[PDB]
Amino acid sequence: AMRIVMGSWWLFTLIVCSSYTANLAAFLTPVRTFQDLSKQL
Amino acid sequence: SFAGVFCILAIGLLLACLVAALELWWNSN
């Protein structure tokens, strides 16, 4: 009833935070590379 | 990569132990 409430709508946002958290993780993505100026560093 | 990340993780334990003592005292009476 009201005892069932505590972690529930807590998870209605914490997992959403976690979804945004794991979301961003890769969004900026002899032979080592392909361009000569990229070799310069 | 995790500074205010685990803040809410402890906040849920706060409201947990809060209502854990609260309804227990309301119902053991």
Elucidated via: cryo-EM
Tokens describing residue A22: 């794991």
Q: In degrees rounded to 5, what are phi and psi of residue A22?
A: -75, -10
Resolution (Å) of this entry: 8.1
Kindly determine whether residue B5 and residue A14, on different chains, have CB atoms separated by under 8 Å: no
Nearest-CA distance from B11 to chain A in Å? 9
Cβ <8 Å between B15 and A3: no
CA distance B11 to A9: 13
Distances (CA, A) of B18 to A5, A8, A25, A38, B15: 13, 15, 35, 57, 5
Task: Please provide the size of chain A in residues.
Answer: 41
